[PDB]
């Protein structure tokens, strides 16, 4: 097995970092990078359970995974409504371990961001709020707390639903 402090290390490093592409030359401003996510995935596999290995399993329906995807689409709506330079106050640590007491305001701000979006001719867009309804559907209530392994599932789901929305894929001649 892996050490039982591998996952808390990657968790507490996800919290202690922030997007700053103006300081690094290699293009990556993500806080859940390919390596932190791959390492949390390996921990969850060889210590806990089998999880999604692929870009996104939208048929997953496990509350930590789903909440991670919801957080991902919220931050996508935010970064699409306002370019964000590229700074945003960090709630990933807060939402990963205490989803309710943060997701309430997160969803309200996401409503505001989709509003700012729809005010412009950028709505026929509108499938962000549709994705949010879809994800909230499978969720009976926002859980009070989440265990560290549930937090790792949260991070994996965030990474998945984050690469699902980006536009860079298979670029090699």
């Amino acid at each position: 097995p892996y050490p039982q402090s591998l996952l808390p290390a990657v968790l507490g490093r996800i919290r202690a970092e922030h997007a700053r592409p103006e300081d690094k030359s290699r293009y990556r401003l993500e806080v859940v990078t390919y390596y932190r996510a791959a390492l949390i995935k390996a921990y969850l596999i060889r210590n806990r359970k089998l999880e999604v290995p692929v870009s996104l399993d939208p048929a997953r329906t496990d509350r930590p995974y789903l909440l991670g995807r919801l957080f991902a689409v919220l931050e996508k709506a935010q970064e699409d409504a306002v370019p964000g330079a590229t700074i945003k106050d960090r709630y990933l640590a807060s939402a990963s371990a205490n989803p309710g007491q943060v997701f309430h305001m997160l969803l309200k701000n996401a409503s505001n961001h989709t509003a700012k979006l729809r005010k412009d001719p950028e709505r026929k867009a509108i499938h962000y709020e549709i994705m949010m309804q879809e994800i909230i559907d499978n969720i009976s209530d926002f859980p009070v707390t989440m265990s560290s392994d549930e937090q790792g599932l949260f991070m994996i789901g965030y990474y998945h639903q984050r690469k699902a929305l980006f536009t860079k894929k298979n670029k090699e001649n």
Binding site: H18, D89, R90, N98, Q101
Partner: protein, 286 residues
Amino acid sequence: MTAIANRYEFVLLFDVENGNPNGDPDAGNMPRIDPETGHGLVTDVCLKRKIRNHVALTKEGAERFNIYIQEKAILNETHERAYTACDLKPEPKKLPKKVEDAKRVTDWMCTNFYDIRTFGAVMTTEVNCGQVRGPVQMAFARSVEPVVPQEVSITRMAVTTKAEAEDNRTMGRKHIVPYGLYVAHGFISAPLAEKTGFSDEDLTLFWDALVNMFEHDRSAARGLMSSRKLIVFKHQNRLGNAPAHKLFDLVKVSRAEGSSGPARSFADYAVTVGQAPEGVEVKEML
């Protein structure tokens, strides 16, 4: 010099109102919270810095009350000043060989520095002056119930550098705690004190600094922070008369019966203090 012969435990209640009591360097500048419970945290070094600022202000940097200042002071230069003040050589990258010499440099760093004498210091660097623990300690201040940090987006009509995109304007940010009642615990140990000569006048200066800590530390990012209650437990002897947890549990902070919404004033809270054991005297007059 003289020092205190009583063990002292204190509980200080301070609150904030539409302010940011302490920022997080890693969370942007969002207030410090415990990410698993949402309670707001205030580092001990923050309150120590506020006490240092109050002492540097009410004493204007007098003798025996210098402060290890925040005006971009060089700590190695202060150590070297200590070495020249004791008439020794600072070129050793470690402590002096003769233990009396190290004792002199450390008694000098403590004798004329309130914040070292009180909160201790680590002066083991390129010019080593040693280590001090210092009698007064404080732990992170934790609010009574979870705080909800709200982000107040603001703007500014002006641009700093040459910007060619400004109807348009640059956006700023603020984080305020609409309200948080915070609780902090402290320990004043007489053995470490007698090691540092932390006196009685130092203690009364510290109590006043605890009361009037926030009356002068105002800014565009703090709102109205205020020290509401200050409960002090004087044990009757140099060691303890009762555990610390037995005292820090006498201070019950609950919400008053009438109020129902989110806490928004100190009158939304009730604070009661029990009767201390036979070995401890509790003073809530601060």
